[PDB]
Structure 1
Amino acid sequence: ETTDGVYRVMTRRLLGSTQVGVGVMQEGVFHTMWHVTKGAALRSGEGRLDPYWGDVKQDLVSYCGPWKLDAAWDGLSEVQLLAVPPGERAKNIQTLPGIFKTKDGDIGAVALDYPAGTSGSPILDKCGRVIGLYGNGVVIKNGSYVSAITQGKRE
């Protein structure tokens, strides 16, 4: 299966079938977070997806081709997290992102909390374009989770 869209990343290694993450298929390339697969090969029906590009520091990985997602948060408008939670249906949640101020620049951030197996779920602009992936972030002073809007570079 190589149709565009959001996918669940699953494993049969632990008890039953467990969802370890989510990813985006776009232009024949599968995009997910590095911590979801650890760079391992993926199965799609009877087919096989091999890793193509990855970076532990960016926490991103692409399969079958180079990173295709290049849309960026405009720094002003609300966005949607297309959350794909484990054992639950794909659900769109709208929010206005905060900011992660780093020594290397500002990055958009979404203040939404979901099970760990939700890592890799895409964040979208008003035209449906993927501006980044959910699942890499921090826990703030109140116990709540805040994720970066993690985007790769299209070469």
Structure 2
Amino acid sequence: TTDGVYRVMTRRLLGSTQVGVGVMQEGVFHTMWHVTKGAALRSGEGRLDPYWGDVKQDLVSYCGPWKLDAAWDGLSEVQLLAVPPGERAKNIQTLPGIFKTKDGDIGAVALDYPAGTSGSPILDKCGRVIGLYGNGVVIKNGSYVSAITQGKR
């Protein structure tokens, strides 16, 4: 199955519904846990079985261990490769904010998209995936900010 960015679809609701987005790289499919809940996936005629997942990180990988290990450099602009339901993939460039936590700081992107955009990759200037979009907060003025959520390789 080809490297790239993928829509995660279900037929269980009304019509065809996009519940999320993911990344195929090095033979492993990467998405957020709340998108699939760890359920298996179909890719054409083939089946993708969950391999690793963690609810607290809100991540899951299929067919193998988590492969994405690039990280935001804390300084440069990044691009969100947003794949909204029913709409063409689009790159949005932005300078990340920061989630400060008791266990360290991670990048965050203040961009709002439909729920089924969950799992869209965030990219550095070399095209490496530095994390996935869609686990975040709503701040005082009502705007959505997503963590740049990255796994461990």
Q: TM-score if structure 2 supplies the norm length?
A: 1.00
Task: Give runs of ≥4 in structure 1 deviating > 2 Å.
Answer: none
1:19 deviation in Å?
Answer: 0.2
Structure 1: gaps of 5 or more residues: none
**Structure 2: how far apart are the matches of 1:116 and 1:140?**
17
Indicate the SS of the match to 1:74: coil
Deviations 1:39-95 (A, max 9, x none): 000000110000000000000000000000000000000000000000000000000
Matching residue of 1:61: 60
**Structure 2: how far apart are the matches of 1:103 and 1:127?**
30
- Asked if residue 5 in structure 1 is aligned to residue 4 in structure 2, the reply is yes
Matching residue of 1:36: 35
1:5 deviation in Å?
Answer: 0.2
**Structure 2: how far apart are the matches of 1:37 and 1:127?**
28
Matching residue of 1:49: 48
**Structure 2: how far apart are the matches of 1:125 and 1:76?**
11
1:150 deviation in Å?
Answer: 0.2
Indicate the SS of the match to 1:25: strand
Matching residue of 1:97: 96
Deviations 1:124-153 (A, max 9, x none): 000000000000000011111000000000
1:112 deviation in Å?
Answer: 0.2
Indicate the SS of the match to 1:36: helix
**Structure 2: how far apart are the matches of 1:102 and 1:31?**
24
Indicate the SS of the match to 1:35: helix
RMSD over aligned Cα, in angstroms? 0.3
Matching residue of 1:114: 113
Aligned residues: 153
**Structure 1: how far apart are the matches of 2:142 and 2:10?**
28
Indicate the SS of the match to 1:71: coil
Indicate the SS of the match to 2:34: helix
Q: TM-score if structure 1 supplies the norm length?
A: 0.98
